[PDB]
Amino acid sequence: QTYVTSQGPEKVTSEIPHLEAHLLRNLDKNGIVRLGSWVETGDILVGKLTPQMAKESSYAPEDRLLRAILGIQVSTSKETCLKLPIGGRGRVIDVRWIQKKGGSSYNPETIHVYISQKREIKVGDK
């Protein structure tokens, strides 16, 4: 799901700063992986650029050293995405994207991803 923080309502995007492009190979232009992708473990399903504070003061000195010595840019967006956990591999069979409609003017969008998996019978099954 998405939330409406102080800075912004966790904008959805198809690109994330300083994220490996290989981890976004299956990400569609809208920001949600499309059907048929053989998503593996650790691959991003839905990635929303949650607006992080411009908190250079709160950043750890190690992070500042890494960003200054190696030239890594300083961004104000938290790394927020639906990374696939250990296991749970498979082929995306269905994607759903909905929002809210009520008294509130803001519409937090919820995304459902259905990952199927054809599991055989192996050592350890019952």
Partner: protein, 225 residues
Amino acid sequence: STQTLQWKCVESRTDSKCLHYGRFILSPLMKGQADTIGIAMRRALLGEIEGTCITRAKSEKIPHEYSTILGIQESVHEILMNLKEIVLRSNLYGTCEASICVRGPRGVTAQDIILPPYVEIVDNTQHIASLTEPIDLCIGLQLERNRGYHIKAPNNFQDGSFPIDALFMPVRNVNHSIHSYGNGNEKQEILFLEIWTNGSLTPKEALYEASRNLIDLLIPFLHAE
């Protein structure tokens, strides 16, 4: 001095196009030979002969395996499952390509496949697809000749290239028996063999290939070192 080793085929029925049966007999085998021959031949027939089959199927305008197509009663996964049972023949090591491009309300069988020059189908009525409405259906396939059961990765996506873990089993079943000959003082025995194949090969050919693969395997020892 007494008799000479003879072997012959005593029965051969063609139950169906893709199912053949054959029983064989051997003659005056002395002790111990029959058991060795029977067990070695059974193991070789069950796990040494190689048979070609379809390994990868590529379809046009299909999102994933568990998807439906308008005008087709069979789901895509059902089509893969039905396609794994097609039986083929070849004798050359290496992968080849094939295609099937058929029109609409026809009813698609195994005779609608397009094959390389050195590959032929054995049955020609195996159901592979059923069509109801006019839609142009085009599917590409890959054929391979390996030994035993092999499992492949889902790599090489393209639009969709579903890999079927084809089983390379040309011999359906094997049985044997070791009887007694009653040759007075000398103990002889009669050996019967029994082979069921799936039509990719035939008995007296699966036996030939199975003997030759074994005599392959036993060979390094003859050379010195």
